[PDB]
Design a protein around this motif. Structure first.
Motif, PDB file in Angstrom:
ATOM      1  N   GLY A  49      27.189  -1.201 -28.304  1.00  0.00           N
ATOM      2  CA  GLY A  49      28.272  -0.330 -27.888  1.00  0.00           C
ATOM      3  C   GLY A  49      27.733   1.042 -27.489  1.00  0.00           C
ATOM      4  O   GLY A  49      26.559   1.197 -27.184  1.00  0.00           O
ATOM      5  N   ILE A  50      28.630   2.009 -27.441  1.00  0.00           N
ATOM      6  CA  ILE A  50      28.295   3.392 -27.152  1.00  0.00           C
ATOM      7  C   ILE A  50      27.414   3.819 -28.324  1.00  0.00           C
ATOM      8  O   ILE A  50      27.774   3.620 -29.509  1.00  0.00           O
ATOM      9  N   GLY A  51      26.276   4.348 -28.019  1.00  0.00           N
ATOM     10  CA  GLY A  51      25.366   4.666 -29.105  1.00  0.00           C
ATOM     11  C   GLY A  51      24.303   3.659 -29.364  1.00  0.00           C
ATOM     12  O   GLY A  51      23.326   3.980 -30.059  1.00  0.00           O
TER      13      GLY A  51
ATOM     14  N   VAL B  32      34.440   6.264 -19.669  1.00  0.00           N
ATOM     15  CA  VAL B  32      33.038   6.648 -19.668  1.00  0.00           C
ATOM     16  C   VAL B  32      32.330   5.818 -18.589  1.00  0.00           C
ATOM     17  O   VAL B  32      32.417   4.576 -18.616  1.00  0.00           O
ATOM     18  N   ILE B  47      30.586  11.611 -27.859  1.00  0.00           N
ATOM     19  CA  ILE B  47      31.488  10.522 -28.233  1.00  0.00           C
ATOM     20  C   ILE B  47      30.719   9.612 -29.163  1.00  0.00           C
ATOM     21  O   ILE B  47      29.511   9.451 -29.054  1.00  0.00           O
ATOM     22  N   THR B  80      26.243   5.278 -21.082  1.00  0.00           N
ATOM     23  CA  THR B  80      26.995   4.156 -21.643  1.00  0.00           C
ATOM     24  C   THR B  80      26.376   2.847 -21.213  1.00  0.00           C
ATOM     25  O   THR B  80      25.889   2.768 -20.066  1.00  0.00           O
ATOM     26  N   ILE B  84      33.471   1.916 -18.715  1.00  0.00           N
ATOM     27  CA  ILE B  84      34.657   1.595 -19.489  1.00  0.00           C
ATOM     28  C   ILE B  84      35.810   2.501 -19.072  1.00  0.00           C
ATOM     29  O   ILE B  84      35.660   3.713 -18.910  1.00  0.00           O
TER      30      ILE B  84
END
Ligand SMILES: CC(C)CN(C[C@@H](O)[C@H](Cc1ccccc1)NC(=O)O[C@H]1CO[C@H]2OCC[C@H]21)S(=O)(=O)c1ccc(N)cc1
Ligand SMILES: [Cl-]
Ligand SMILES: [Cl-]
Ligand SMILES: [Cl-]
Ligand SMILES: [Cl-]
Ligand SMILES: [Cl-]
Lengths: 99, 99
Positions: A49-51, B32, B47, B80, B84
């Protein structure tokens, strides 16, 4: 129900005898729940995911009641900041995105 | 449309006159997108998602078309793993979750 998106689409779920709050998430391929015990065998997996990535345990054929609707499928367990109901279970309750 | 979730809910978006693919994501508060050039000034934002956090560029009042519906709003640009479309723009195109 019709769930608007002005706020996070949070619902109550029941899983492994526990009540949890979870996000209905069309962006998630599979359901991922914060650390808990579930019965049966599991196998490890990485999801992204994000991160970046996290390592999860994959449990198959788990029943979850989502907003009072029963579904069965794979549940991933790991260090997610939020409980997420993903597409693998959203399909089973007949959930669609409409616009 | 009525979009089922057996497959990823991918749609074509138009931003800066360019077509891109993006994921309709009810689990995302914000939209994003991968690195790209956008006009005007940006502001900082962090985020947080499943694997930790990322820093992004926040651009406001950006014209964007999503699955043929016009929107004008905030687009975050940064690393990202996939493009999304979050609730900020899903609400602009009138999207709801139904089951
Ligand atoms: C980024 C998506 C492709 C995938 N994710 C689902 C996504 O809906 C998450 C779900 C989510 C939500 C909260 C925290 C972590 C994960 N939202 C998210 O990261 O949104 C970010 C952008 O808007 C902000 O608002 C929410 C966090 C920020 S995910 O949670 O990483 C994930 C990935 C794979 C599976 N099987 C299940 C979940
Ligand atoms: Cl089912
Ligand atoms: Cl499944
Ligand atoms: Cl169907
Ligand atoms: Cl579906
Ligand atoms: Cl916005």
């Amino acid at each position: 129900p019709q769930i608007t998106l002005w706020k996070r689409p949070l619902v109550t779920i029941k899983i492994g005898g526990q009540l949890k709050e979870a996000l209905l998430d069309t962006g998630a391929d599979d359901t991922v729940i914060e650390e808990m015990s579930l019965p049966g065998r599991w196998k490890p997996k990485m999801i992204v995911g994000i991160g970046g990535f996290i390592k999860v345990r994959q449990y198959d054929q788990i029943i979850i009641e989502i907003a009072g609707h029963k579904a069965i499928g794979t549940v991933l367990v790991g260090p997610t900041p939020v409980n997420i109901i993903g597409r693998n279970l959203l399909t089973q309750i007949g959930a669609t995105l409409n616009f």
